[PDB]
């Protein structure tokens with residue numbers, strides 16, 4: 001199952017649900033009620049987080065799922081200084 | 097042997113994985129299941145070069161070392177609509193503010 | 201505050217001792233390891249109460265640089281002291297005891313090789 | 318005394334410290350009183366045969382940032398019974414750090430600590446930056462974990 005995450009600047013991000021659930025904040029946005037007669041969501045709107053950040057946040061979700069419980073040596077998750085502060089903000093918000 | 101992909105058209109961006117071995121056609125089948133458009137209405141690119149349904153992602157140049165989870169490789173998408181052979185357009189991401197002096 | 205040894209002599213002492221410290225057995229293991237640095241008195245008081253003149257390779261390496269040793273035999277004396285000290289505390293048959301014995305060998309064979317070549 | 322200390326076994330153990338991380342690794346031995354002693358650092362990719370003893374307790378950190386690392390996909394390593402000479406293997410890897418703690422590392426690495434509070438960020442994150450990775454804080458956590466796991 002895929003969910004749609006949408007950035008402040010209107011970009012759409014289509015990721016696997018299980019990946020997104022990495023975010024406690026999103027886990028609590030999806031697991032609660034909504035959609036007439038449905039007990040979980042499939043679309044989330046971010047008001048603060050821009051595209052260039054939310055992209056990175058998804059990149060992380062990917063990485064997290066791939067490399068959790070892996071006996072493969074792990075590669076470093078890269079962050080460019082320019083994006084660091086916003087990404088920190090976003091993570092803090094997203095609880096992940 | 098896996099590759100990690102961003103499939104991107106306009107203000108859409110799909111985060112998925114596929115086998116290095118698996119085919120450009122098979123990828124369009126994944127895209128069908130998400131967006132609801134058949135393979136014959138798609139057209140996938142690596143940069144500006146169009147891909148071939150037969151070739152493997154590995155042959156198009158998507159590899160373990162150049163499509164990593166933390167740095168996925170970007171697959172261009174364009175939608176045909178009968179004779180509407182639309183152009184490849186990827187709405188870029190927003191820009192970050194300039195690096196505060198304390199981080200230089 | 202000590203008159204320097206001839207440069208060549210100090211170089212010999214280093215070669216001999218490095219030859220020892222570096223030597224690894226058939227299985228890939230470096231024998232010198234356990235002996236490089238003594239335990240602390242806090243760590244192992246038994247050793248210091250029983251061994252009269254403690255010494256480790258760290259000290260010897262430092263005594264060569266500081267020119268305490270004036271001949272290859274001054275040096276040999278202090279390596280033999282080490283290995284004897286080991287042999288007095290660890291008791292025959294132990295993986296440590298026999299390592300000290302191999303290292304006695306390694307040392308003399310090193311001496312004969314550098315101090316007659 | 319404490320719940321996390323090496324046992325004075327006196328029974329040797331041949332180990333391979335293998336740094337599969339991109340970090341310069343600081344091996345940390347926990348002594349018989351459970352205090353951590355630092356040992357020579359392993360550069361990235363490097364591996365070394367090292368002499369330790371049965372029951373002796375080790376953890377591994379970034380030598381520079383004191384960031385936590387894994388060893389055989391866990392936080393502590395104690396060498397098992399050698400069996401027939403052949404050595405025991407300690408594979409040191411990165412963990413999967415939380416995006417937050419990962420970002421923290423990156424900012425801390427670019428900014429002098431005297432300037433954390435001159436960044437345009439929520440006031441809470443000043444404190445989070447200042448709360449540096451520390452083995453002493455961790456050992457408490459790992460203890461109060463084993464202690465909570467001895468109900």
Ligand SMILES: Cc1ncsc1-c1ccc([C@H](C)NC(=O)[C@@H]2C[C@@H](O)CN2C(=O)[C@@H](NC(=O)CN2CCN(c3cc(-c4ccccc4O)nnc3N)CC2)C(C)(C)C)cc1
Nearest residue numbers: 234235237238239243256285286356357367368369370373
């Ligand atoms: C190179 C490197 N790179 C990354 S880590 C690293 C590195 C890793 C490990 C080490 C070094 C090689 N390894 C360690 O330090 C290990 C690692 C950690 O698990 C603690 N540890 C010990 O060795 C601790 N020894 C014991 O608990 C038991 N000891 C009983 C006393 N015993 C004896 C010594 C001497 C004797 C010595 C010198 C001279 C003449 C002597 O006769 N003689 N008899 C003995 N029974 C030695 C063993 C110690 C309290 C600290 C002592 C050194 C470097």
